[PDB]
Amino acid sequence: DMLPEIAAAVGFLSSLLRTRGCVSEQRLKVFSRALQDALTDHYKHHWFPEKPSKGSGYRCIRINHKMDPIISKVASQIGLSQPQLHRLLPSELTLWVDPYEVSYRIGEDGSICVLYEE
Template sequence: MRVEVTSAANFLVRLLRLNKESAIVSDQQLEVFRAALIETLRIRYQEHWFPEKPCRGSGYRCIRINGKMDPVLAQAGVLVGLPGQFLHRIFPSELTMWIDPREVSYRIGENGSICVLYDEREVEESMRQERNSNNIHNKQNGGGHSASSTPNSSNSPSPSLGGSSSSESSSPSSMDSSSGDPSAGCRESVRSEMEFMMDARNILAFEHLASYVSS
């Protein structure tokens, strides 16, 4: 639950930062709000979290802003001195967020696309690919070392080795073992237009959200 709730709280705080009115709120206040929101959501979902049935209780865990402020966000705001009316003004006028086991998704606007903020399956797949890349890298490096450490016979030089001076330089170059962060994709047909909104860890992507937030 901690990962899902933290992903949601980070995203909501970054949305707040995009609104010009949030300039009167200090970074420290926003960080305290983020911590209060994580704890509020954790307590609220404690008895309504079913990893074996992720869709169960999804409506209860849904965060909704439309004509009125979501009470969970308002509660976290009161704890840090940010009134619900103020938060309602600087959050997007229409926002829906679903915080479920193994997946967090959101929608800005009533007719907006549902976009995935966090998907445990994509994270696990990325980690698996990174492990495989590391294994290949280690095997190739190990093979290069074993070949270069073979002693050369001065009495019977082997033409295939080409001399010991070039054995190390011919070792395979190290592979790039870093795997890119999983791309969070839209579930609907506007993936190409909203691709920049998918990755909650990319701060630059959130700057493009400003037009949605302030609309």
Template sequence: MKEEIKSAVDFLTNIIRSRDDVNETQTRQFNDSLTNLLSDRYQDHWFPEKPFKGSGYRCIRLNHNMDPLILQAGNMCGLDLLFLESSLPPELTIWVDPRDVSFRIGENGSVGVLYQTTRDSQSQVQATPSQSTSTHMVQQSSDNSFHQMNRNFNNTIMACKDQFMNVLPSISREAVHYQQFAGFVSS
């Protein structure tokens, strides 16, 4: 859980750090505060054997409203709501799941990976602090090449809507209500 939380918090911290009017002490305090808040929140909602269980509870969501934990961490280090809203994208979703941390900027944006590891392997994929798209990832294991990792990423990551649609194949894909419900689930 620590590595997953660290990747999500570092991602948000690096966005805030890019501002000229924030100092290193504030960003370090924000990082520490948000790490502690998320650790407390996820403590009884972390299921490595069922990584999607509790996924909605662990989701960090900005949809023109500030996520309460981000706001609380900001307030703890002197970063107010106005500063956070002007620093972070208005539409941002971060899914913090066991062995996988992904993000999406905008409602229809592509899903990018911040952290990913398999149960059987210690190899990890982690975005570097200054990179914000899934195509610019660094592999920390020497076992596989970057191209193999990128191929695996493209074959395994699906949007939430696509995942939902693949779970219930018995429902007709042409059904309008099914498409609308899948879109609602993904938002």
């Protein structure tokens, strides 16, 4: 039910690490599965398909001077350190993973990009 939205968000992050970092497609497959698991666990009791923006603040993935703690923990379990994540991911990024819609913004004043929409 939350599968495809979380898959799209994870893939977006995984693609950033591939493109900017040349992180192995092999290592990134493990990372993707790891992060999928972690986000579906985090999101379980906070997903309202009828009100897609309900809980969106909670589900929101934010990166700036502080790394999102879930991304940080999962990347670390997989071989990507936090100094790496700061270097390889965009310096300010926000990712909204909601029922029927995944969107993101790079930079505070970046435009809103829709990634997944059903």
